């Protein structure tokens, strides 16, 4: 795909969940650089 004309990306913002944060979309791989690699486990709630 291509971004909207004259735009370099898309900001998707949830309108129903005020606690959900934004998501973003770029259409050129060169606009992102994988700065940190994080290794983790999810933790079971107590």
């Amino acid at each position: 795909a291509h971004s909207p004309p004259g735009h370099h990306s898309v900001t998707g913002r949830p309108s129903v969940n005020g606690l959900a944060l934004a998501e973003y979309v770029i259409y050129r791989g060169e606009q992102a650089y994988p700065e940190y690699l994080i290794t983790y486990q999810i933790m079971r709630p107590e």
Binding site: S3, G12, L19, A20, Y27, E30, P34, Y40
Partner: protein, 161 residues
């Protein structure tokens, strides 16, 4: 030409990345279906990704976008989860890492919520979960996320429900 450098848990940089991770966990509307049920992570390791070629590739595109957006790159740090993480850190992001059926268009997606990106570590919808247990909520197997520098430039605002 990619090198991974371990950050120390006693390093401010490690701690800053861990806090972004932990502080952006939220609940999801699928009740944990895709990414599992959790309120926090156990961080095992944080490595800095160094590749001179991929960096200049990024800073060259950043300059173009910046000048197109009147000297404003609009650069952020954002999370990305993917089955393709090991290819990404060595070869960089490209069309193969895009989401054809994303609800904001067929591009490469990033999240402010770490738990949102966690939903994609084992694939769209969580795939079939971890390889070993086939458990999307596995508390045993190790997962990896990327925390990325992203150039947004002039970004189109789309509201979604």
């Amino acid at each position: 030409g990619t090198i991974l450098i371990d950050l120390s848990p006693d390093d401010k940089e490690f701690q800053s990345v861990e806090e972004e991770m932990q502080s952006t966990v939220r609940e999801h509307r699928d009740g944990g279906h895709a990414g599992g049920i959790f309120n926090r992570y156990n961080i095992l390791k944080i490595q800095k990704v160094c590749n001179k070629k991929l960096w200049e590739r990024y800073t060259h595109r950043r300059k173009e976008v910046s000048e197109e957006n009147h000297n404003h790159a609009n650069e952020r740090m954002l999370f990305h989860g993917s089955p393709f993480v090991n290819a990404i850190i060595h070869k960089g992001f490209d069309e193969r890492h895009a989401y054809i059926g994303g609800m904001f268009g067929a591009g490469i997606y990033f999240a402010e919520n770490s738990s949102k990106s966690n939903q994609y570590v084992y694939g769209i919808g969580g795939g079939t979960g971890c390889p070993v247990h086939k458990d999307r909520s596995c508390y045993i197997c190790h997962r990896q996320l990327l925390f990325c520098r992203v150039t947004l430039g002039k970004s189109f605002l789309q509201f979604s429900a």
